[PDB]
Amino acid sequence: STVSPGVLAGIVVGDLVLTVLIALAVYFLGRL
Amino acid sequence: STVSPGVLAGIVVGDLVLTVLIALAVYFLGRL
Ligand SMILES: CCCCCCCC/C=C\CCCCCCCC(=O)OC[C@H](O)CO
Ligand SMILES: [Ca+2]
């Protein structure tokens, strides 16, 4: 087979951190 | 190693849930 536990965690934590970065950037670009 | 179907489903849903709440949070905050 499915996915290794390390690959999944990396993908997901990566997904979420990116989600946060985008959210911050939308907020601040919205301050302009 | 390999991730069970149950855990994969739990993780995928946990990700989705945190994603929409992060989006909601920025919706609210951007409104201030
Ligand atoms: C292999 C591990 C990858 C780590 C990735 C972490 C990302 C999920 C973070 C928070 C979920 C919190 C929301 C709660 C939603 C239901 C609980 C849940 O996610 O359950 C997972 C568990 O594996 C059920 O078997
Ligand atoms: Ca995502």
Side-chain angles (χ1 to χ4, degrees), chain B residues 2-25:
Chain B
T2 207
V3 171
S4 80
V7 180
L8 179 53
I11 292 305
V12 160
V13 161
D15 180 283
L16 180 157
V17 165
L18 300 167
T19 299
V20 302
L21 293 180
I22 284 170
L24 186 62

Side-chain angles (χ1 to χ4, degrees), chain A residues 5-30:
Chain A
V7 163
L8 185 59
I11 294 174
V12 172
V13 168
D15 185 42
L16 287 169
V17 294
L18 172 66
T19 293
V20 167
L21 164 71
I22 291 164
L24 285 171
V26 167
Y27 179 84
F28 285 110
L29 279 160

